[PDB]
């Protein structure tokens, strides 16, 4: 029942002259998941730009050791307000340094978000709608082009269902979305991003899980917009959804036969957030501590959540939002506390991802033609023999990979 | 403030040879509204097919006198389950007789609904989705063609937001809508209806007033579907919306610059329906009496509702659902009781529509060229002189109408 997450490849071992390494004993092991187990990680920016020193840096590096032993995917911040507070002077270099550092850790990268009404550029409010739109399109061209080859996945536009009717504060993006409409805006931002990076994975993202989001997506697809993956947020501060609700959402959004990314996951290990709060940002409390029984609940619920999503074929990524407690809403939504205590949820998900869902080392022998069949979870593998180690991909297409001296 | 509801025309009075009737004293009066003040009227079917006799018929005719003194628009029933309970044997003649009778009363007609998951054809459940769709399209061709020239306005498809996720019972329309999607289905039913009647007014209708309906409409329009009017239901058994909520809905649906029809209006003159009930059809209570204070509330709320809608330029029709108490849900939702007592709401809306919103007789004299300028509410008028009476339209286009012997 996790067959769709697994595969078989044949590798061929040859000498330099093409002759088979026959009856050769080898060891094969998984080194990476193809499935994207991600986490937002915004500390990478100040870290990779040498903003920390001494024991604060050691404490942060301690957390990175745990982080990279679990995740293979990272969401990076591109909020226009933060990325370009001064018009014409983007923070390109800072995030290049962050992406290049993360790239040496061998994690996939996504940038988030290119277009959003929250934390957008404040100076937009001085421009006409015509100019705002023109500038948003140029922002996309610029940033997608500059990070091509380095960040090739994007949340292009975010929370489009509420975007035009957002009333918490005036912003440029609500203005243009109200002016030209959700569908025209989405079409143009996707067009612009594709123009700048033919190989980019382009997401639309939203927290809205009711029929307004699936109707929007149906309208976009029928109007010629090409979406590479549907992003669904999963901030469950007010209580875990449960399996049944999760599966109703998965089935309904699966009708499009597009990859589904669970883009932003939260379960808290303290008291739940009151259920009547609509916009989560309105819940501003001074302190929100983690509790022991809350940590047990968080761990159990997180396992059930990850299992439910991994079990669904069209799901292709699960991204946790806050790795450390006291992030967004100062919530205990992390796997690690601020004083670097590893919470039960880390042990639970580490066991799930790096043990239960991990193919164990295999001792194999090549046949007369130097062929070795490998079965396991889709991802990256190594074959070892003669003290040499060689990487290969284990994917769906049963094409034989040749490996030489 | 109701300028958009009014206009000016010049009429030219000429003898049979084209020579002007100069300095001719005439009387002009309004005979009809252009604005569609409608009411569903399903009794027309048994009435016009001679199903009533004696004093039941007299009692019904008594109500029709009041009905036609108020309304200029009628919604007729085309529920597929009722219209064609036996496959291949539609109830065409019955509704032809009803429409022809109503036509002699000079009221505009709309048929409702051509495609809907509720009270559809039960025998669809024996067919494949392919056949269901094929048959629904043929139903539309047939009925739109047969009633061309007689019924030229249609609720083509109804409650599309819930249609694919409707789970109260299995039906053929939910099946095909889930299969091919809301947008493809709507496109095809509108295409088919337009093919059968180029001059037809084609509505989509829904009770859903949240952003899921306006997002659906935006998707339809962007996918090339041409909608003549947006239908919004307004069944307020659980309490009048209020002006503020009504106006938020009007503004939001006005962005499409299409006519808006308020297709099904209900306010009750007894106790309100409990607010937590989602599906109104579930509220099946043995008795639901009208009260005096409830009738005062009903009248005042109905005036406020009609005023709010009439004041909004893009609104072009308001249709009450039940003219007589004890109709749908046996609710006191009518203007008249079952023992033919005229309720306050009738007197309130009659005064509003046929007095406050009615241009009073004008005594005018034509100039040397036989020209008479007429101002008033858009609609049909008569000019009278020499004991002769002549109809003309008062509309937006500044066109002089000539009137001869």
């Amino acid at each position: 029942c996790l067959q769709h997450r697994m595969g078989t490849t044949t590798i061929k071992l040859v000498a330099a002259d093409g002759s088979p390494l026959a009856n050769k004993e080898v060891t094969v092991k998984q080194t990476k998941h193809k499935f994207l187990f991600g986490c937002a990680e915004f500390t990478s920016v100040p870290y990779a730009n040498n903003k920390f020193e001494g024991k604060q840096k050691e404490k942060i590096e301690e957390r990175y050791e745990k982080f990279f032993d679990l995740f293979n995917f990272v969401t990076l911040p591109f909020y226009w307000g933060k990325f370009e507070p001064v018009k014409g002077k983007p923070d390109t270099e800072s995030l290049k340094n962050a992406a290049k550092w993360l790239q040496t850790k061998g994690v996939e990268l996504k940038g988030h978000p290119l277009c959003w009404h929250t934390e957008t550029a404040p100076w937009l409010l001085d421009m006409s709608n015509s100019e705002i739109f023109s500038t948003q399109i140029k922002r996309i061209h610029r940033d997608v082009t500059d990070f091509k080859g380095l960040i090739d996945m994007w949340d292009v536009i975010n929370e489009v269902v509420i975007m035009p009717i957002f009333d918490k504060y005036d912003n440029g993006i609500t203005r243009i979305c109200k002016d030209m409409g959700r569908i025209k805006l989405v079409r143009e931002v996707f067009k612009a991003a594709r123009e700048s990076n033919p190989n980019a994975t382009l997401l639309i993202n939203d927290f809205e899980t009711s029929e307004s989001y699936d109707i929007l997506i149906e309208g976009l697809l029928e109007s010629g917009v090409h979406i590479d993956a549907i992003g669904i947020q999963s901030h469950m501060h007010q209580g875990y959804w449960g399996v049944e609700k999760t599966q109703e959402i998965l089935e309904r959004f699966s009708r499009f036969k597009l990859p589904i990314h669970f883009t932003e996951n939260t379960l808290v290990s303290g008291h739940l957030m009151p259920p009547e709060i609509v916009d989560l940002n309105d819940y501003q409390i001074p302190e929100w501590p983690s509790t022991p029984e809350g940590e047990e609940r968080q761990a159990q619920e997180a396992v059930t959540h990850y299992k439910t999503l991994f079990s669904h074929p069209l799901v292709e990524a699960i991204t946790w939002w806050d790795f450390v407690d006291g992030g967004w809403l100062k919530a205990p939504s992390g796997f690690i506390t601020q004083d670097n205590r590893v919470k039960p949820i880390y042990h639970a998900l580490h066991d799930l991802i790096k043990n239960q869902w991990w193919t164990k080392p295999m001792d194999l022998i090549s046949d007369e033609n130097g062929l070795v069949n490998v079965s396991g979870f889709l991802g990256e593998y190594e074959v070892t023999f003669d003290g040499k180690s060689k990487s290969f991909c284990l994917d769906n297409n049963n094409e034989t990979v040749t490996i030489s001296a």
Side-chain angles (χ1 to χ4, degrees), chain A:
Chain A
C1 87
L2 292 181
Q3 191 60 55
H4 61 279
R5 296 302 182 194
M6 292 173 88
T8 304
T9 309
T10 300
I11 62 178
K12 185 177 188 165
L13 306 182
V14 295
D17 63 349
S19 176
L21 304 185
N23 311 126
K24 184 74 172 183
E25 279 163 48
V26 304
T27 295
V28 176
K29 55 164 170 149
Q30 188 173 7
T31 58
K32 195 175 284 144
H33 268 291
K34 178 160 198 282
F35 189 97
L36 297 180
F37 296 109
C39 192
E41 173 30 47
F42 297 173
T43 303
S44 60
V45 175
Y47 179 74
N49 288 286
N50 303 304
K51 273 285 196 301
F52 302 115
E53 54 165 297
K55 276 195 166 173
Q56 188 183 4
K57 182 173 169 180
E58 288 173 359
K59 164 175 178 187
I60 288 166
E61 282 165 349
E62 195 179 296
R63 290 201 289 251
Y64 277 131
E65 178 158 61
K66 297 286 157 198
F67 182 99
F68 294 119
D69 193 43
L70 185 56
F71 303 117
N72 63 351
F73 178 40
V74 170
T75 301
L76 281 180
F78 277 81
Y79 310 100
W80 197 0
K82 305 295 159 194
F83 187 74
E84 188 176 356
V86 176
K87 184 183 173 186
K89 284 179 178 183
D91 187 42
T92 303
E93 280 310 295
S94 289
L95 271 113
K96 274 185 146 279
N97 293 321
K100 284 171 193 182
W101 172 66
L102 286 172
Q103 183 177 60
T104 71
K105 303 293 182 164
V107 305
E108 183 92 323
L109 296 174
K110 180 179 74 176
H112 163 91
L114 292 182
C115 179
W116 189 35
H117 46 275
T118 291
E119 291 193 301
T120 198
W123 36 263
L124 291 178
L125 295 183
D126 294 67
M127 296 164 113
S128 71
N129 289 359
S130 170
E131 280 170 47
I132 295 168
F133 169 72
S134 187
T135 311
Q136 173 66 94
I137 292 297
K138 265 149 46 182
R139 180 270 158 108
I140 290 161
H141 284 314
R142 182 193 62 198
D143 290 351
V144 169
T145 298
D146 291 347
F147 286 80
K148 181 177 190 299
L150 174 56
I151 305 177
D152 295 311
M153 185 178 319
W154 302 97
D155 288 348
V156 173
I157 191 170
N158 198 50
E159 296 175 11
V160 172
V161 174
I162 197 172
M163 168 170 301
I165 58 175
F166 190 76
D167 68 1
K168 297 299 184 185
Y169 44 81
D170 199 354
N171 66 95
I173 304 309
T174 293
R175 281 189 192 187
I176 64 170
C177 189
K178 192 188 176 175
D179 189 8
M180 61 193 305
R182 281 175 272 238
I183 287 178
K184 281 188 170 163
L185 178 58
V186 170
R187 176 154 66 243
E188 289 305 314
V189 297
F190 267 80
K191 177 175 142 90
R194 174 64 65 226
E195 280 174 334
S196 291
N197 191 351
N199 304 126
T201 303
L202 304 186
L203 280 90
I204 189 172
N205 191 46
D206 216 311
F207 62 74
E208 187 54 52
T209 64
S210 83
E211 59 270 9
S212 55
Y213 186 38
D214 78 67
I215 289 167
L216 177 65
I217 290 168
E218 192 179 320
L220 294 172
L221 291 174
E222 283 293 314
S223 305
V225 181
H226 289 303
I227 299 168
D228 294 317
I230 301 167
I232 302 173
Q233 306 174 14
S234 200
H235 290 293
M236 291 171 300
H237 301 59
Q238 292 163 298
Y240 172 50
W241 287 353
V243 169
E244 184 180 307
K245 175 180 172 182
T246 302
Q247 275 168 352
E248 184 284 336
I249 289 166
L250 287 178
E251 289 313 316
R252 201 165 85 247
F253 282 91
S254 285
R255 71 161 186 277
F256 302 117
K257 299 185 167 170
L258 292 176
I260 298 165
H261 290 203
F262 271 66
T263 53
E264 315 182 11
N265 291 267
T266 305
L267 292 161
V268 300
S269 65
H271 66 72
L272 299 181
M273 188 181 122
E276 67 277 9
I277 301 275
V278 182
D279 180 343
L280 268 50
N281 287 297
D282 295 338
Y283 195 64
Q284 296 296 309
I285 65 175
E287 254 143 342
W288 194 349
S290 182
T291 64
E293 47 273 305
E295 288 176 9
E296 192 183 60
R297 185 227 305 132
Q298 195 203 18
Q300 282 166 3
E301 287 180 345
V303 165
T304 299
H305 189 52
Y306 274 61
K307 277 180 169 193
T308 302
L309 293 177
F310 194 63
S311 290
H312 190 93
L314 275 178
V315 174
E316 289 190 358
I318 307 160
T319 293
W320 197 263
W321 198 240
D322 280 293
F323 187 59
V324 46
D325 282 350
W328 185 43
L329 306 184
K330 309 159 204 167
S333 49
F335 296 6
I336 297 187
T337 69
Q338 308 198 245
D339 45 61
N340 280 20
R341 182 172 58 79
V342 174
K343 300 168 62 176
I345 183 164
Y346 185 89
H347 299 301
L349 286 184
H350 185 282
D351 176 69
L352 187 62
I353 293 171
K354 306 300 297 305
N355 178 31
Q356 310 284 6
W357 293 347
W358 196 266
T359 297
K360 290 169 173 194
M362 287 155 294
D363 290 350
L364 301 171
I365 178 171
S366 64
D367 73 8
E368 73 205 69
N369 286 291
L371 295 182
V372 173
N373 299 320
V374 180
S375 288
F377 283 93
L378 299 176
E380 191 170 3
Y381 283 71
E382 281 185 9
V383 57
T384 295
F385 58 102
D386 305 344
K388 315 284 189 168
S389 198
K390 312 283 194 180
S391 292
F392 65 99
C393 187
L394 195 169
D395 229 313
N396 280 315
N397 52 248
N398 48 282
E399 185 171 318
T400 299
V401 196
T402 292
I403 300 169
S404 307

